[PDB]
Amino acid sequence: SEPSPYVEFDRRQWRALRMSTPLALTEEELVGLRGLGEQIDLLEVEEVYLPLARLIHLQVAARQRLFAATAEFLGEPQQNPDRPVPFIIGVAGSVAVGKSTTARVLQALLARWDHHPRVDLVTTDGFLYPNAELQRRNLMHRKGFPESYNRRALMRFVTSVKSGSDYACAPVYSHLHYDIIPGAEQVVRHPDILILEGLNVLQTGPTLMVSDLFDFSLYVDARIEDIEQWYVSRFLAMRTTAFADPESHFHHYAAFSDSQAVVAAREIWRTINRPNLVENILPTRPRATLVLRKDADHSINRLRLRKL
Amino acid sequence: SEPSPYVEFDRRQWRALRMSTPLALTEEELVGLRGLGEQIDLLEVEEVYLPLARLIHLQVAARQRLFAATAEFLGEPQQNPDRPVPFIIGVAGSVAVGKSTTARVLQALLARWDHHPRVDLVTTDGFLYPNAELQRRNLMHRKGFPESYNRRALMRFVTSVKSGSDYACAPVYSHLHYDIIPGAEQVVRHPDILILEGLNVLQTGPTLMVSDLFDFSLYVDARIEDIEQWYVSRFLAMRTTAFADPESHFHHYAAFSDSQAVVAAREIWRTINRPNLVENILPTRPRATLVLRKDADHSINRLRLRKL
Ligand SMILES: CC(C)(COP(=O)(O)OP(=O)(O)OC[C@H]1O[C@@H](n2cnc3c(N)ncnc32)[C@H](O)[C@@H]1OP(=O)(O)O)[C@@H](O)C(=O)NCCC(=O)NCCSSCCO
Ligand SMILES: CC(C)(COP(=O)(O)OP(=O)(O)OC[C@H]1O[C@@H](n2cnc3c(N)ncnc32)[C@H](O)[C@@H]1OP(=O)(O)O)[C@@H](O)C(=O)NCCC(=O)NCCSSCCO
């Protein structure tokens, strides 16, 4: 036998940990959060996301006590009871694994908490370098990799917010144009909770990084072959959604046949997304507070929690 | 202007943070902790180590609330009020920087806390591979480097203790024989606080490591040229202490002249200790909760605290 920092759960065990947590989300609101391909329904929100929201609100008060201790030690004032220390959450995972929806659902739940906390959600792609700058660094084929984001700027952003700033700015990325939007900004004003979602978020290193500022993090996981399947399938579905727009950077993909589309999508997975997942994303899975394991049908039926 | 995760202090500012913290250490007890070359006196213990001990005891209660939240969420019992969750402390730094004394002094202070906590101290060299095994891996010239320790065993040890085990074993290293002592063990029995001191301790990576289990850590820092100076000087002093013992693995060093000794000590610093410090130890300085900066005279007159 051997001791471990983690505790594994199946949905039956984890759903019981919901207790009385109310369900403040309608089936229609879920739709507004549901991403293309995603199978998440209100049942999963009850048996999986509600226990998560509970665990997170238990730790928010606790986390603040810790920051209180340091404040006390330093002989500082105290804390405007209504302008606390932002609880930062990191959501990571591979492209097409569902992390985007997971973060949006988590934000909706936490925000509808009795004390109605101001909960902001920022995706890291707003921190991607503009295509022209990526071109400069010869990184257009490495878009999504750690070095494709302005990690300095990202770290400055999260640091500014958790340090108690009145406001902090983040650039905005346009998936439609496949590039940063000139002049656009997302202003975050001292939220009570900040969710940061991106491929890169849990990465660690020789310098203090955004992951070192997280008070809680989740990794959305799945069999790599399944994620590729979801990616390719989402790619074919996009021919009639995003790619169908004449303004789309990838509008030429709309006319691909099922066959040509699979070939193109598989190649991008093989040369860009798979390498990034295997080399940079997966290695960060061990440090996540909670790992959500999804089955081939996108169903979350297993979880791994870090008690230590 | 720019926000930061750290707050810098000079001794004048930091010593004021002592408040009423009692001094339960005699000048003679300090001697029993003082390492060869070290200049630490009771004044430094009051202006620097006492504020540290205070800050640590404020965070111990706070840290436990956090583990309490998770226990509550999981619907577990509660916690024998007298067999809690061990607060783990990491102490890192270069060879000859004084980290060994710093850890021993910290242990003495914390243990003499009103509620008399059971405080254990474990140095990582007990986890060094035996010379014969180092020979096997061709690492005898890399002794001290991360790959020279059994990190798997070390992680198992710290994990076992923080997980609440009744007892955990650690091998024992003999500096006199420059090797692991066959059959020797240090038994740690559910301490309230465990201090882990070693060159490697704050290292991070692709797997969950000992640093991920620390609730607080300190890095003992200094100008690299000063540390080399301290190393060489300690080396010459050892000719009449440790090396003077016929049983010493390095007994041949006792007969070196000042000149030959400096040459030998400088070469080891250049080929082993300096490379390790620069490549593996220093890069971990950013993640330490508290950095103790020492001047050429070993004096600690600056500190960097991680509030975030
Ligand atoms: C741009 C980048 C780095 C963005 O990374 P993300 O972490 O946002 O990827 P993720 O899979 O989480 O996508 C997030 C959302 O972004 C959507 N999206 C991604 N690419 C596009 C797109 N080109 N047009 C419209 N929507 C898109 C995707 O459908 C998600 O929507 P939902 O919120 O409704 O679920 C990534 O998509 C990428 O391009 N990686 C490497 C290069 C690559 O894959 N190129 C192929 C481009 S055409 S395939 C578009 C669907 O993947
Ligand atoms: C074995 C190892 C990895 C141990 O690392 P540590 O983190 O314990 O080094 P650190 O500088 O903290 O030494 C801790 C104590 O260990 C003592 N010590 C180190 N080497 C020896 C020794 N050979 N004989 C007796 N005492 C020794 C040192 O004087 C400290 O005593 P205090 O508690 O009184 O301060 C390291 O000393 C080493 O050998 N590194 C690379 C190879 C090397 O430097 N070889 C030269 C050996 S002769 S020089 C002995 C003094 O450095």
Curated annotation (Swiss-Prot), chains A, B:
It is an enzyme of class 2 (transferase). InterPro entries: P-loop_NTPase (IPR027417), PanK (IPR004566), PRK/URK (IPR006083). Pfam families: PRK (PF00485). Pathway: Cofactor biosynthesis; coenzyme A biosynthesis; CoA from (R)-pantothenate: step 1/5. One of its GO terms (molecular function) is ATP binding. Its main location: cytoplasm. It comes from Mycobacterium tuberculosis (strain ATCC 25618 / H37Rv). CDD domains: PanK. SUPFAM superfamilies: P-loop containing nucleoside triphosphate hydrolases. Was identified as a high-confidence drug target. It is found in: Cytoplasm. GO terms for biological process: coenzyme A biosynthetic process. Keywords: ATP-binding, Coenzyme A biosynthesis, Cytoplasm, Kinase, Nucleotide-binding, Transferase. Belongs to the prokaryotic pantothenate kinase family. This is Pantothenate kinase. It catalyses: (R)-pantothenate + ATP = (R)-4'-phosphopantothenate + ADP + H(+).
